[PDB]
Design a protein around this ligand. Sequence first.
Ligand code: NA
Ligand code: NA
Ligand code: NA
Ligand code: NA
Ligand SMILES: [Zn+2]
Ligand SMILES: [Zn+2]
Ligand SMILES: [Zn+2]
Ligand SMILES: [Zn+2]
Lengths: 108, 108, 108, 108
Amino acid sequence: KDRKILNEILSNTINELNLNDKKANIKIKIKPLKRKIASISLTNKTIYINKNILPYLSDEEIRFILAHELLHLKYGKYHINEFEEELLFLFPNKEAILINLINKLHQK
Amino acid sequence: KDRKILNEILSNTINELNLNDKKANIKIKIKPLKRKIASISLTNKTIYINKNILPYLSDEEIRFILAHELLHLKYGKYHINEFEEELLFLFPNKEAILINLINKLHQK
Amino acid sequence: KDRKILNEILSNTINELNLNDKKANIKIKIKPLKRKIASISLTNKTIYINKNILPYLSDEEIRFILAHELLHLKYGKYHINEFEEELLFLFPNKEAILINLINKLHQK
Amino acid sequence: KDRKILNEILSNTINELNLNDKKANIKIKIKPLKRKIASISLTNKTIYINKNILPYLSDEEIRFILAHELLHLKYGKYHINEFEEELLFLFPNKEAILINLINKLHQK
Ligand code: NA
Ligand code: NA
Ligand code: NA
Ligand code: NA
Ligand SMILES: [Zn+2]
Ligand SMILES: [Zn+2]
Ligand SMILES: [Zn+2]
Ligand SMILES: [Zn+2]
């Protein structure tokens, strides 16, 4: 079957969120995943949808899954591993936001 | 202090996601919250930001928090409680999406 | 088929965690669930496992699912709804723990 | 101050869950953490509690945090990275359990 409908979801969701030139050039690819629905690969600059889940997802479900992944991509940052001497990309979460807040209160 | 900057985040994030007329008319209000950063009240048609957290959040943090809440609002649905004889609004999550999939496989 | 093996998991997991007399008297019941694997009903004092998921779960999976639910039951508390004039049971989470911390810093 | 009360929580929580000889020999250490409350290090065989959070946590909070981490440790497994030619430890979650279920339905 065709994945023409999938590249259209990706593109109009990329535009909606207003992704910067670097994060905006991301392709979509159907591949079997061991333990997730979707997965972002920053080295490949692609998002993978689980080959086995996609045939059962509704249009609304796919649109939500993708917009949710890409939102976390949009507000993610790069950090230095130091020990591994490697660049590491970290996605945001409420625990990270709240721990940092309290941490900053304790520097005072 | 002024919350003029907060209503501007809300409005341009509402437009970005393309919220329908009903979900789009949502106001923002600073109020103390017992156990959350933000909280949507569908009867009041307002989103509350924790009075105590907001002074420490960055512009990027607020933009992400709000866009995350509103995304879950956008793809949420109403369901009948039956027992309580009341309307109930349910937000999406990966467990709900995957349980329904398997459930649908078992009707066959 | 028999659910004799299921009541044995429940009982030895209840004992392991050391649940108090009130929370300890909880029965287990196989029932179809709309959007979850397991679900605790405090009025019925029972835990429901999704009829459609259970045939595919391993022994280790069931043991983990149950121990995870019962742990959140063990450290949960009752709170007054005030508006609804009803008792409400709230399960713990990292957001609830961290929001309360910061809230307590702002009373000073 | 003393961390004698912390090693007592760890030990009786290790015994309660019935951790196997390998996972059971785990020490506890107070250290500042960038974005988490607690963190398990399998190479160091230690659990770290955030230096800045711990002074504000209640006895019940600490007991729950630790029992929650150690439960996910207990039902975690090792997997081969293949590409990195390294051993990787993976903690359980409902998405991993449900994705695997559907994946197994598609091998048929
Ligand atoms: Na655009
Ligand atoms: Na618009
Ligand atoms: Na006992
Ligand atoms: Na023991
Ligand atoms: Zn999220
Ligand atoms: Zn979410
Ligand atoms: Zn949990
Ligand atoms: Zn968990």
